[PDB]
């Protein structure tokens, strides 16, 4: 009765009175409450940040569902927290322009793909007469290809630099996130050390010597405390040996080398760097400029899912295409022998006949024809007639038509078919779990249907996945002195990666009646 009088206040703060559950100290499930910045109840909505979470649940339900499911989640939060740290961030003109470009990067690169269509539409008009370009529409359009080719190369260059100021810090973040943790826990550079293989980890030996190492992880303390936790284990100062305008010289060298050394490893930059190098080649000749239309395979999510199918099962596939090569080599050995006489390309007669008497070419003969013919090998060879081998030649042709085109191509075309049923079912299980089990507690829908409506509330009013991020926003964005006792329990355990505080089994309803 007192609270219905209070409704005016609750309705306003409802958007950003986030709340979560923890198994806090007392083993019973406390339900803490925390402020959420209205910017935080916004930034986590519109952009990639919603889709990135959708990638996440697909990356757990299809891959986790285990002890890491409560740990990858924060690993998703600390990344996503870093994303908004980027957006909060988004010569004085330079950074103002550089931020202008980095925020435009999806629209901006979409314009790059747009120029990839605009130019190749103009490439279409080329013909030899000497390569030449007829320009029936006008006359100044050919220079427009000279102008669009620069304008694209301009976008081809200024996209990567925005990529350098957008996704890359994240990519450098999660590399350091995966490093700083291992020094503080696994101790591998202090102990286990990766050996030759997993060289990506071996490359990471270089950064740890750097003072500027924890640049994007929002924890300078990292290296200072590794020695506290590991230097007592065998040696103090030796670990410290492992750790620790004027602007021209101010930058550290081995860090920044390592940074580009991680950025090169990233597929997204190596592609855009590949997307650009050809655009530089597109000046040197326009037909090397057409590779850019492959960007549509990455430039639209629609095709990407279709092409993803082909690489989704492609390791099985390329082996089969390779097996195809090998089963064809078995016929060509049976063909180079025995049925050798049958092969011919006898124009008029005898004089210009092209019997494939060199097997290396005979092997090439079947792949250029028998794999392709669709009729099998016998469709493009002398038809047997009266030979004793004729009974045998059919057996060579039938089996080749079955085993190759009616099976191995049938498998190759066919492995793509199942790739849509695997990729779909993976999409199904994501939804199938979410409709049932809560992502967090794991209780599932059925306990929570006992109350009216129910489970949809438990996925919003309760755990709602997101608020655990906002609470991790709230902790990282809060003075260590300022914590409430529940929050300090979280933050302390959060440092230790014990992760008990995520509810497991019990929730606030499980705990009570």
């Amino acid at each position: 009765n007192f609270l219905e009088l209070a409704e005016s206040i609750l309705e306003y703060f409802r958007p950003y009175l986030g709340r979560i559950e923890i198994m806090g100290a007392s083993r019973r499930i406390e339900r803490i409450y925390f402020e959420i910045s209205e910017t935080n109840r916004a930034q986590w909505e519109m952009p990639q940040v919603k889709e990135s979470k959708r990638q996440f649940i697909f990356d757990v339900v299809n891959e986790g569902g285990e002890a890491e499911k409560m740990e990858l989640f924060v690993s998703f939060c600390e990344d996503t927290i870093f994303e908004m740290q980027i957006a909060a961030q988004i010569e004085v003109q330079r950074v103002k322009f550089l931020n202008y470009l980095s925020r435009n990067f999806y629209t901006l690169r979409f314009l790059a793909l747009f120029l990839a269509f605009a130019i190749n539409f103009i490439l279409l008009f080329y013909k030899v007469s000497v390569y030449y370009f007829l320009e029936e529409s006008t006359g100044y359009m050919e220079p427009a290809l000279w102008c669009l080719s620069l304008l694209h190369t301009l976008v081809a260059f200024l996209c990567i630099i925005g990529y350098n100021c957008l996704k890359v810090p994240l990519v450098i973040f999660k590399r350091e996130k995966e490093l700083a943790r291992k020094l503080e826990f696994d101790g591998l550079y202090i102990t286990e050390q990766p050996g030759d293989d997993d060289v990506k980890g071996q490359w990471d030996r270089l950064v740890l010597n750097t003072p500027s190492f924890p640049s994007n992880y929002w924890d300078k303390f990292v290296k200072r405390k590794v020695l506290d936790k590991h230097g007592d284990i065998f040696g103090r100062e030796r670990i410290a040996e492992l750790l620790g305008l004027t602007w021209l010289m101010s930058i550290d060298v081995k860090y920044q080398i390592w940074k580009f050394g991680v950025i090169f490893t990233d597929n997204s930059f190596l592609y855009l760097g590949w997307y650009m190098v050809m655009s530089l080649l597109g000046h040197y000749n326009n037909f090397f400029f057409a590779a850019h239309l492959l960007d549509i395979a990455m430039g639209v999510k629609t095709l990407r899912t279709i092409l993803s199918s082909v690489t989704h099962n492609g390791k099985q596939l390329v082996m089969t295409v390779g097996l195809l090569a090998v089963v064809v080599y078995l016929y060509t050995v049976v063909a180079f022998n025995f049925f050798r006489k049958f092969y011919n390309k006898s124009e008029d007669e005898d004089e210009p006949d092209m019997k494939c008497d060199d097997m290396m070419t005979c092997y090439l003969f079947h792949m250029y024809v028998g794999v392709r013919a669709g009729g099998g090998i016998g469709d493009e060879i002398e038809d047997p007639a009266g030979d004793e081998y004729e009974l045998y030649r059919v057996v060579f042709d039938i089996t080749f038509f079955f085993f190759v085109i009616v099976i191995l191509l049938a498998i190759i075309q066919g492995l793509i078919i199942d790739a849509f049923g695997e990729l779909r079912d993976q999409q199904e299980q994501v939804k199938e779990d979410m409709e049932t089990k809560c992502f967090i507690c794991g209780i599932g829908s059925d306990y929570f249907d006992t109350t009216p409506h129910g489970f949809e509330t438990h996925t919003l009013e309760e755990h709602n996945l997101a608020n655990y991020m906002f609470f991790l926003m709230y902790l990282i964005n809060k003075d260590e002195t300022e914590h409430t006792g529940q929050e300090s329990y979280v933050w302390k355990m959060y440092q230790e990666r014990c992760w008990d505080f995520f509810p497991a089994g019990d929730c606030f309803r499980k705990q009570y009646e």
């Binding site: 007592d232 284990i233 065998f234 040696g235």
Partner: protein
């Protein structure tokens, strides 16, 4: 050396009185001819496994005894 080792075992972090006890478990020949093999003999492990089995046995069969935890 018997004195130098006490500072050297803080790397492995067993208490120093105990380290002196280990040096006594060693034959401690001459000034400090302590063979490393005369220290592998502590063999005794059967019992440590059995103690672990016992304490685990109690830890599982009688939970929520603060004294035992």
């Amino acid at each position: 050396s018997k004195k130098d080792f006490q500072k050297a075992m803080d790397s492995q972090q067993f208490t120093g009185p105990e380290i002196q006890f280990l040096l006594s478990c060693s034959e401690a020949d001459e000034n400090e001819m302590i063979n490393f093999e005369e220290f592998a003999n502590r063999p005794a492990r059967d019992i440590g496994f059995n103690v672990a089995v016992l304490l685990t046995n109690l830890s599982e069969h009688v939970p929520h005894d603060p004294r035992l935890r």
